[PDB]
Amino acid sequence: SAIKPDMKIKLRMEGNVNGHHFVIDGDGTGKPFEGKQSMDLEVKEGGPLPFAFDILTTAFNRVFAKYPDNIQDYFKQSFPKGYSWERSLTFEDGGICNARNDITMEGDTFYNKVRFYGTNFPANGPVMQKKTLKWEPSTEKMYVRDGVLTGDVETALLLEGNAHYRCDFRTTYKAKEKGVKLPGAHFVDHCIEILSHDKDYNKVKLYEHAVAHSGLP
Secondary structure (H helix, E strand, O other): OOOOOOEEEEEEEEEEEOOEEEEEEEEEEEEOOOOEEEEEEEEEEOOOOOOOHHHHHHHOOOOOOEOOOOOOOOOOOOOOOOEEEEEEEEEOOOOEEEEEEEEEEEOOEEEEEEEEEEEOOOOOOHHHHOOEEEEOOEEEEEEEEOOEEEEEEEEEEEEOOOEEEEEEEEEEEEEOOOOOOOOOOEEEEEEEEEEEEOOOOOEEEEEEEEEEEOOOO
16 A cells, blocks of 8 residues: 555645635645545635635545445555546536646655636625635535546535525546546545634634445445
8 A cells, every 4th residue: 555544735725716816835634544634724825815715625635535345446546646636616606616636645745736716706695705604514426427537516505694505516536547447436425624713714724524435324
């Protein structure tokens, strides 16, 4: 196994939401086999961010997910050469964006080159007004569509005042190494939370727990 039980995470995201440019650095640690990761995020440029930090978090690696023996782990088989993903998020009020991550490994460290582009968010909407509280736990459906590993998520952000703001993600995953065998369809349950933050989310501690299953208990 190229992958150790304890892997470090290095991350730089360059992005633009509704015109606003920003650069965010990440430094964290994770247990790939337990499906757990936590990282410290620091806004390096464009702060304070004039939009809800929460729309970024899922962009801050499915290599951190507990896979049972009876599902093919595409992600952990992708290393050490690594893999990329591209994602389109579609929000109920027209807000759309495209995120990509190119993931590489060097010794005990995953390096992440992340790009995040958002547009069409209404000025009076929960994202530009900063009314989001968190992502609800989600289930990512994994399947193959025209020879590409694809994940669909129908989810929501909890808003101030008991309301939800609906998310549809579609992610395409591609190993750098030709002939990493595609897995069979399956599910990944996700648990993403902001553990701590300063006043304007210039510094954020992020945690994710993910588990792969066939649908049964």
